[PDB]
Homo-oligomer: A and B are copies of this chain.
Amino acid sequence: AIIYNPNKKIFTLHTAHTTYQMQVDPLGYLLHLYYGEKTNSSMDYVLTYADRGFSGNPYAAGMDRTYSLDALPQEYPSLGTGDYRNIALNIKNEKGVESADLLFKSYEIRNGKYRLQGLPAVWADEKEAQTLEIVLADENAQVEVHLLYGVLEENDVITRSVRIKNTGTGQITIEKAAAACLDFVQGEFDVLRFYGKHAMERNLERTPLGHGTIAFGSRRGTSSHQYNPAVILAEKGTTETAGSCYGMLFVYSGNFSCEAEKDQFNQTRLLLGLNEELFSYPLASGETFTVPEVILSYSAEGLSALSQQYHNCIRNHVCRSKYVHMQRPVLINSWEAAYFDFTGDTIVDLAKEAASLGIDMVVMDDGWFGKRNDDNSSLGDWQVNETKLGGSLAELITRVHEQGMKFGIWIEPEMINEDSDLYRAHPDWAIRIQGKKPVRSRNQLLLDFSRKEVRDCVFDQICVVLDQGKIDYVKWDMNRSMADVYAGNLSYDYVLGVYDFMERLCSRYPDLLLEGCSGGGGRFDAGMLYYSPQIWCSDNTDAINRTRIQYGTSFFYPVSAMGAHVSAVPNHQTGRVTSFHTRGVTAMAGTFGYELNPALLSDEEKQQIREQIKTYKKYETLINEGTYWRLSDPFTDEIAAWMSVSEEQDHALVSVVRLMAEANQATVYVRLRGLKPDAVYLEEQSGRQYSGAALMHAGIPLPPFTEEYEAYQFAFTEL
């Protein structure tokens, strides 16, 4: 629900269980009053006013020294109000002046959910959602700012976006543009963020917010491996199952900045949006710029509920793929299995092997195009290497189909190698600075996807390939960060170009399952999930590391979105050995699939694959649609444990991987969550019956281990 009280100039946004409230003050400033548990009260009483030294006053406040935007909580604070905190907006006007001082002009409440020009965004129908659009302006800056709030009641989600219009005659530049700001007049908080590196993404870091700023972001041209564009502000003491917490999630696959600051008056400001670095975005007279969307959510009852709200929002209101509500083929991917050393014949052998085990699809990964026999050439040359494939791609697809198998293929359309026909023809199509030798990464360069001519060339090549046969799946990879950034519009316009290509591809091939990828989870974001129902979660396929990566990824993203494959051991990234069973349990927390040559496996491991596939298919709907619960913290605990629970709470699958081993082992219990306390549940394998209360308070004792890194799955059915 969205309500306006014209007398108090208060806007209230209600979800099923939350309330967000803002007010236009007598000077025209849009103040933030409240976000938290549902209330019908007017929360303007929380505002207080004192003469605070060096916190100065708008001219319009006259002699009232107690009114300062350096103290008051705001919806969209800006550089140019006298506020000295981190700010959401900085405009450099047509005379070089950095100032924006925004006053209320008008509003509209609309049924349904706004869409964003050229960008992914949350979507919903006119019954499920409402939109508030508030117009603010600064007549000296000659800017008009449209704040967009999307309210999805059942999901307990409030989205925010911004459109900025130049209303003057000369060009302005947008120098900083956040999508969302939360100002808290009180509270002690921790900041949860998800940091990592290539092949070890999204480790949880949780620290108290001390005085000053905790900040993180990306200027890599991508959302990044290093810091995901996501933040949780948890009230001190909040746990998985109790206490207030707030999320912001950026629906965006490019650069970003997140800032959380505890100020001089013990107030907290949380910002998320575009990075101000390499962002000086020109806006001509009368033109509008759109800031990508942030999904906000609040939980009064801990982190697990907050995550569940995000999972549901992403599955049902971000992902547009038909595969959200369909079985997804269990695939085998050629990359760890063969790297570049394959032929058409060895792809068909992989299909034969995989077919005999119950695998549904073979994915021919990197190495099939140009003269790509290593990673030093051929990106941009998306012509099938028929020498290597021993014939045409059409013939290969048919040979695979004849083994009863679907076919998928890898592409990397944003990239070019110096050693390519494309680069020899068009060296100026690479992102570079004139006169400067560019950074190389994986011995390749980015194509300038801000340029239509560049995108069109590559799009046409990819269409020729995809039109050769029935290709049910594409893995779209992206294997380096952007450098040599030549202008202040490039980072943003590059990503517009990526999304344009992706939209064109998905529209042309609406039955295609598109798996996003960027050296693993280098663009693991809701922007990509708008197009792809799954993203390769990490290049690290070590089961033990995957417990951490998948744990961290679950704070915002649904299990269904996490690409996860059983791979060979010793693991190619770590050298560690894990049992085949443990690899299977860990990879079932995601898409499932395989990425190895099954011909090298023992007959016992081949039979495990057969049984694994049967297990995953049996539980696929539960894993993908069920309510997810983290049952342990793999950074600190003896086990990595999680579970999925059906909507009716009549079925649950519990997964456990042991992380630590000593002699004379203590008994370890796994405590379940999300069941009906008074219901009786049958554990399938053992045939024992337990109340939900018992399972949640005492849990179940794990069988004693006899080897390292042992794993377990337990299924429960309500009687």
B-binding residues in A (CB < 8 A): 34, 36-41, 43, 45-46, 48, 50, 52-53, 185-186, 237, 239, 241-243, 265-266, 664-669, 677-678, 688, 690-691, 693-694, 696-701, 704
Contacts and interface: CB of A to CB of B under 8 A. Distances in A.
Contacts of A50: 664-665, 667, 704
A658 B40 CA distance: 30
Contact of A266 (B41, B666, B693): B666
Q: What is the interface of chain A mostly: helix, strand, loop, or mixed? A: loop
B666 A37 contact: no
A241 to B, nearest CB: 7
A45 B690 contact: yes
A666 B267 CA distance: 9
Contact of A37 (B185, B239, B693): B693
A693 B265 contact: no
A39 B242 contact: no
B666 A697 contact: no
A667 B39 contact: no
B667 A41 contact: no
Which 3 pairs from chain A and chain B are nearest by CB?
A: A242-B242, A39-B693, A41-B694
- The winner among A38, A243, A667 for most chain B CB atoms within 10 A is A667
A237 to B, nearest CB: 5
A481 to B, nearest CB: 39
- The winner among A241, A666, A701 for most chain B CB atoms within 10 A is A666
For this chain, the copies found in one complex come to 2
A84 to B, nearest CB: 15
Contacts of A266: 666
Contacts of A48: 667, 701
Given A43-B698, A688-B45, A52 B664 contact: yes
Nearest to A704: B50
A53 B664 contact: yes
Given A52-B664, A186-B667, A704-B50, A37 B677 contact: yes
Given A53-B664, A265-B667, A691 B242 contact: no
Nearest to A50: B704
A48 B698 CA distance: 13
Contacts of A700: 45
A557 to B, nearest CB: 25
Contacts of A691: 39-41
Nearest to A667: B48
Given A41-B691, A239-B237, A693-B37, A46 B664 contact: no
A243 B237 CA distance: 11
Contact of A697 (B39, B265, B697): B39
A693 B244 CA distance: 14
Contacts of A693: 37-39, 41
A666 B187 CA distance: 12
A691 B45 CA distance: 12
A545 B455 CA distance: 73
Contacts of A688: 45
A39 B426 CA distance: 72
Given A37-B693, A241-B242, 19 more contacts: A34-B697, A36-B698, A37-B697, A39-B677, A39-B697, A40-B691, A41-B690, A41-B691, A41-B694, A43-B694, A43-B698, A45-B700, A45-B701, A46-B698, A46-B701, A52-B664, A185-B667, A239-B243, A265-B666
- The winner among A37, A43, A668 for most chain B CB atoms within 10 A is A37
A36 B46 CA distance: 39
18 contacts: A34-B697, A34-B698, A36-B698, A39-B677, A39-B691, A39-B697, A41-B694, A43-B694, A43-B698, A45-B688, A45-B700, A45-B701, A46-B669, A50-B664, A185-B669, A237-B239, A241-B242, A242-B243
A670 to B, nearest CB: 10
A682 to B, nearest CB: 13
Nearest to A693: B39
A542 to B, nearest CB: 28
A264 to B, nearest CB: 8
A669 B186 contact: yes
A423 B233 CA distance: 69
Nearest to A71: B667
A694 B44 CA distance: 11
A558 B226 CA distance: 53
Nearest to A668: B186
A694 B239 contact: no
A44 to B, nearest CB: 11
A45 B703 CA distance: 12
A470 to B, nearest CB: 52
Contacts of A666: 265-266
A177 B45 CA distance: 58
Contacts of A704: 50
A697 B45 CA distance: 13
A634 B694 CA distance: 37
Contacts of A698: 34, 36, 43, 46
Contacts of A53: 664
A664 B53 CA distance: 8
A91 B574 CA distance: 59
A409 to B, nearest CB: 48
A666 B697 CA distance: 42
A41 B689 CA distance: 9
A701 to B, nearest CB: 5
A436 B670 CA distance: 60
A669 B46 CA distance: 9
A695 to B, nearest CB: 9
Contacts of A701: 45-46, 48
Contacts of A39: 677, 691, 693-694, 697
Nearest to A703: B48
Contact of A696 (B37, B40, B239): B37
- The winner among A36, A664, A694 for most chain B CB atoms within 10 A is A694
Nearest to A690: B41
Nearest to A51: B664
Contacts of A46: 669, 698, 701
A21 to B, nearest CB: 10
A688 B46 CA distance: 12
